[PDB]
Nucleic acid binder design. Structure first.
Ligand SMILES: [Mg+2]
Ligand SMILES: [Mg+2]
Ligand SMILES: [Zn+2]
Lengths: 115, 95
RNA sequence: GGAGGUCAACAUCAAGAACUGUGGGCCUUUGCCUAUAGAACUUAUAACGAACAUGGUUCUUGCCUUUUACCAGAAC
RNA sequence: ACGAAUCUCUUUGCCUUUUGGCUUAGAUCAAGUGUAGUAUCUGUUCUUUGUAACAACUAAUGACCUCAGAGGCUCAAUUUGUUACAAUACAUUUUUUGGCAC
RNA sequence: UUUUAAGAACUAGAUACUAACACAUUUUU
RNA sequence: AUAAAUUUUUAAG
RNA sequence: GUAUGUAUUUAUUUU
């Protein structure tokens, strides 16, 4: 059990493409794989101000946070993501947007930016 | 990469697909509802799907009385309760 | 009673070039001197093995982010 | 008059919830990247003979009896078979392949 | 009571997670 | 009239 | 050098 591991013991039969089919059927029934949501550890580039406890996320702070693929698609095709972060003092979720056309973020729902 | 990735890989799933055919594993801690009740199957199975509801009834039921102060939050959570308890009713009715 | 055994137990195998017992004299048992009997196995281009591994500590190095794992010489 | 006791306040003393470590101040205050490791998915289509007649059959509750819960008795249209009728073929004189039209 | 997901078949091709590690970057036009 | 030949890999952080 | 932590009671202890 090495972190860098070259081989993985497989059962003696294991038709691999067959396991791709049966596993492809299995992929629908599970709770986690289908969550439509995501969890990512990240930073806050633009700092923050909370709109509930008026707490300040000072400049760039680690967070365990939540990424979501947005139904928008920038221009004809570019991906655009929406991230959420919980506040340390209060339970509150603040969201982001990533503008590919204007490199900087723009945010909504529960926080304001410092100037 | 968080184990969310590592538990869903093919090499994890395939042995579950063998355990369903060779025995009585396959959890029910994994799958979701299943959405429709009457489409469920032999009683010894819906029996486990039902507890797979009552447990959440217990978790969020405890999560009711907590002072933690979010009233909107406990409102939506309250509706979620009612929804689940109705589901419990449905699983009993099918039985 | 003889031949054996891919049997066992207990002794002994690195030293003043070296073992043990005994007789006699001196000191006062030890120890020294003298006399006598028996010494298997191992030793001189030195050793039980006409063969040949590993480990510990301490130094010197060699790789060189750090520790195991290591590089090659020495002493115990 | 002082001795004695309680309550209240002020001053002094004690100090009461009174900074609990070391290493290069431990390092740094960035239009920036490299490098190492681990894991596989999204779209579409498809699926979820009729009528009539005759004959036969169709769990729960209560009460009573017997035996050591079981047995028996009473009480609040559907299926099958047979028979008959109707429906599912064609152009050369009597019907629907016109002898009509001007 | 309410509710629709599950199965079969076909297609082309690349994308997520982790940063604890290293960051004089120098330099020839 | 010269015959002179070092290496070599795994884990953890 | 891919954290870590908490909870996951089903079978009903004499009034
Ligand atoms: Mg360390
Ligand atoms: Mg560490
Ligand atoms: Zn806040």
């Amino acid at each position: 059990s090495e972190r860098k591991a070259i081989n993985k013991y497989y059962p003696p039969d294991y038709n691999p493409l067959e396991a791709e089919k049966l596993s492809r059927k299995m992929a629908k029934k599970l709770k986690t794989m289908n969550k439509s949501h995501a969890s990512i550890r990240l930073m806050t580039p633009f700092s923050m101000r909370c709109l509930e406890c008026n707490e300040y996320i000072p400049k760039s702070r680690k967070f365990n946070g939540k990424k979501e693929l947005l139904k928008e698609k920038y221009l004809d095709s570019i991906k655009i993501y929406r991230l959420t972060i919980s506040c340390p003092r209060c339970a509150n979720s603040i969201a982001f947007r990533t503008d590919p056309g204007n490199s900087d973020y723009v945010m909504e729902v529960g926080g304001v930016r410092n100037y | 990469s968080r184990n969310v990735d590592k538990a869903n890989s093919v090499l994890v799933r395939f042995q579950e697909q063998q355990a369903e055919s060779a025995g009585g594993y396959k959890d029910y801690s994994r799958y979701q509802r299943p959405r429709n009740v009457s489409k469920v199957k032999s009683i010894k199975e819906a029996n486990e799907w039902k507890r797979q509801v009552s447990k959440e009834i217990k978790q969020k039921s405890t999560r009711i009385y907590d002072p933690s102060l979010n009233e909107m939050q406990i409102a939506e959570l309250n509706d979620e309760l009612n929804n689940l308890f109705k589901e419990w009713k449905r699983w009993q009715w099918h039985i």
